[PDB]
Design a protein around this ligand. Structure first.
Ligand SMILES: Nc1ncnc2c1ncn2[C@@H]1O[C@H](COP(=O)(O)OP(=O)(O)O)[C@@H](O)[C@H]1O
Ligand SMILES: Nc1ncnc2c1ncn2[C@@H]1O[C@H](COP(=O)(O)OP(=O)(O)O)[C@@H](O)[C@H]1O
Lengths: 408, 408
């Protein structure tokens, strides 16, 4: 299993904003808001790697909308590219304003995977997103999402974030614990992972083949459910316990779904199944080339795949109603949104405005399932070298075990 | 390779606005805005070839929208045809107002290609657009766009701008470095280039044939990808290095995609491939005459053509939702917009208003991919003589090497 040593080190964090600096900006904020309609006062300051949040306490009678409404102008008066108004801060009666730091200090992938949360993570498919507005590492579980929709226009840092996602898997799981199906409608982005042992087939470039890989996944999903039913198990996890225990008890289990066709035929022995992850780099391109069936397959996978251990990672730079459709969205409750062109775009992916206010370069809004405000996360940066490195590391540890069956 | 000597010389730049004149206009601006609601003060003045930008500092509490909102009236009070309000000036807290100079000084094509940016440009397909609002040359790379959408109503200077684009290629590349497919639904504009050696076929006039040219392009694209795969190369550039090195090392490469059909058949030797550029003068006409297939073909080309070295230049005077559609826009992120009839039209091409505020005669808004405000560019003027001249210069340097295969 490749060492975190392959990752570039955390660059000198030349941070720290003198108590005086922060206090100065605080008064400035107050002044500027005062110059416009609202009278408010800073309640507390929380600096971070990319932005600094100023929780302000609105004067009597002032409505939050008034603050949100002049985020464009406030930003200008402060000479910052944009400012993010967080209308509600749980438990407090304050509102928050996140202003971009003059010097954004970078977040290195190694700086995230080094956390104990990622280290002690028990999932086969953990996703280290980056740091929250306060510098703390945000580690998630793809298997609990249990599918992911990713959107971001060019320049937002979406591609890097996807690499961060893939590397999160590759730094924690072996091919027998997690397998991948990579669809790259543009022989660009994912082609750099060709050959790693986790791949179930080559990086899919032909869209017709990609459609088959999706069909294959539905079948593999159905087969697993059939298997688990016979085993008296509820999901891949339980299936794997059953099979492991059996092996630790010298009495290995045998495929219950085996059908004898000859007196010779012998039931093959069961082995642990890997968590399957299907990532489509630009699913709007797959939809465009192939048609309505891509959407239908996605919906079918996403509505039932969880318990079987098959998970979807769908990314696009075209967050429109035509691409992120009702069918696609239906059972993919978890959304990550990097910077997008407009509130409209933001709503398409997050069903809520905001992503348009992101700063680019990995700044994102992570929205897990259920009510709850999206979590702002400053994506970790991972270079093509760090990726190229981890790939070679894995190519050494094993050759590509393809199932040509899948793409046909 | 034709000499830049064929281009008319830069006419006497009788510019210079006395420090007093500029200071007078500054106070005038202040006064007029004051006569209306807003109170502002000029922070700095930046004169240019076509307009002069006055960075103003809005008084406490005044919102940019108020300024933008009375650009129509301010223009009248200033006796200028229109005024452009730039709501955000990176890093500063000022707003900008671009007023048309009384005497617009022209920008000659020679005055642009003379720049070091164009001279030292390493691309086979550079595009010298013109001068920015400050008189500086704007040189771009079609290959990095990697496709271009151009819109402008009659009188905006779109035709001249396209000629400027074509001449940018013709002044830097030979037929073996760059080839062209010209579709002219109106046997008008592009017919003046007939015969130049770069043409892969005659200037396409029949739309049915044009459709085939597009089909041919998809095929050529597919073939190149197949080629590059076999070569272990990522794109046309890498392909050409491989083949060039081979030649410089006396051991030339041979077509890996060659299939022997006879013991005689011998693998043809590989030669460097040209960057292909397909320009459609009025793609709204092609769509009208041919149908849904034009759009589908465009989308197919634009979604994958980059790495293979094939690039699209699509222009139209009809920037409507029916023409610049989602399919077309899908993978053509780079947009150039000359003056258009309305904000609606502007949004159709730029997904943003503004192009309606342009001054005509080559005034444009160049929008490269990603976030970022469009770059206003005063397009260089190129006469029919300068074009006629560069054509003849090339017709002498070589005869038209057509591939009749393409149009059928
Ligand atoms: N997390 C990050 N931190 C700092 N810079 C980043 C980060 N993610 C991306 N970038 C910068 O942005 C550029 C573009 O990122 P990329 O992921 O390729 O964007 P997209 O594919 O969405 O256009 C990179 O070249 C890199 O310098
Ligand atoms: N860059 C430019 N600078 C100065 N004048 C220009 C420029 N581009 C065009 N013009 C003027 O505008 C006229 C129309 O330009 P043209 O490109 O044919 O417009 P369109 O085809 O969009 O109607 C030309 O006859 C020329 O005098």
């Amino acid at each position: 299993l490749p060492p975190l040593s392959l990752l570039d080190p955390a660059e000198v964090k030349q941070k720290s904003y003198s108590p005086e600096s922060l206090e100065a900006m605080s008064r400035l904020l107050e002044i500027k808001l005062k110059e416009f309609g609202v009278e408010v006062s800073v309640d507390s300051v929380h600096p971070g790697p990319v932005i600094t949040r100023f929780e302000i306490q609105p004067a009597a009678g002032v409505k939050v909308s008034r603050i949100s409404n002049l985020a464009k102008d406030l930003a200008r008066s402060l000479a910052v590219i944009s400012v993010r108004v967080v209308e509600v801060i749980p438990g407090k009666t304050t509102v928050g304003i996140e202003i971009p730091n003059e010097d954004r200090q970078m977040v290195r992938f190694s700086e995230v995977l080094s956390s104990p949360e990622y280290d002690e993570h028990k999932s086969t498919v953990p996703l280290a997103l980056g740091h929250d507005i306060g510098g703390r590492p945000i580690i998630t579980d793809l298997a609990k999402m249990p599918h992911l929709l990713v959107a971001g226009t060019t320049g937002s840092g979406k591609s890097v974030g996807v690499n961060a996602m893939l590397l999160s898997i590759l730094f924690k799981s072996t091919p027998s614990e997690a397998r991948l199906i990579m669809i790259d409608p543009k022989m660009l982005e994912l082609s750099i992972y060709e050959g790693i042992p986790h791949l179930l087939c080559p990086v899919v470039t032909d869209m017709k083949e990609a459609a088959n890989a999706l069909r294959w996944s539905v079948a593999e999903m159905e087969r697993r459910y059939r298997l688990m039913a016979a085993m008296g198990v509820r999901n891949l996890a339980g299936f794997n316990r059953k099979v492991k225990d059996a092996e630790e008890a010298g009495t290995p289990l045998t495929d219950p779904l085996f059908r004898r066709e000859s007196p010779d035929d012998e039931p093959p022995q069961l082995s642990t199944l890997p968590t399957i992850v299907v990532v489509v780099d630009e699913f709007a391109d797959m939809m465009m080339i192939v048609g309505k069936k891509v959407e239908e397959l996605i919906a079918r996978i996403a509505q039932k795949a969880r318990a079987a251990g098959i998970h979807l990672i769908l990314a696009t730079q075209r967050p429109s109603v035509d691409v992120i459709t009702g069918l696609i969205k239906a059972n993919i409750p978890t959304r990550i949104a990097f910077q997008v062109s407009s509130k409209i775009d933001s709503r398409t992916i997050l069903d809520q405005g905001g992503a348009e206010q992101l700063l680019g370069h990995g700044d994102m809004l992570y929205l897990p399932p259920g009510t709850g405000l999206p979590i702002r996360v400053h994506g970790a940066f991972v270079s093509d070298d760090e990726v190229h490195r981890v790939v070679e590391a894995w190519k050494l540890r094993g050759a590509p075990d393809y199932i040509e069956d899948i793409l046909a």
